[PDB]
Amino acid sequence: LTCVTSKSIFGITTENCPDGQNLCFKRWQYISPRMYDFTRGCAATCPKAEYRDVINCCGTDKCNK
């Protein structure tokens, strides 16, 4: 599995996920009422987000682009 790890106007950076990591993720991390921080990459499991966070996972190449 290959996942996107960063994206902008320049394009995307991708990573061939390590062994056992067969999901891509997108995560919104609550920082404060007016701020969320965004990450995306490879994962082994799709953890349940704690309150105020959102985590979405998928299992096909570059699905988190």
Author numbering: 1 to 65
Paper text:
The three-finger toxin (3FT) family is widely represented as structural motif, mainly in the Elapidae snake venoms, supporting various biological functions. This fold is characterized by three adjacent loops rich in β-pleated sheets emerging from a small globular core containing four invariant disulfide bridges.
These chimeras were named MT7-1/1, MT7-1/2 and MT7-1/3, numbered for the respective grafted MT1 loop. Loop 1 of each of the three molecules in the asymmetric unit of MT7-1/1 superimposes precisely on that of loop 1 of MT1. The loop separates from loops 2 and 3 as it does in MT1 but to a greater extent. Thus a new toxin with novel properties is created by the grafting. If MT7 is compared to chimera MT7-1/1, least-squares gives an rmsd of 3.13±0.02 Å while by SSM gives 1.4 Å. Notably, a two orders of magnitude increase in affinity for the α1A-adrenoceptor is achieved for chimeras MT7-1/1 and MT7-1/3 by the grafting of loop 1 or 3.
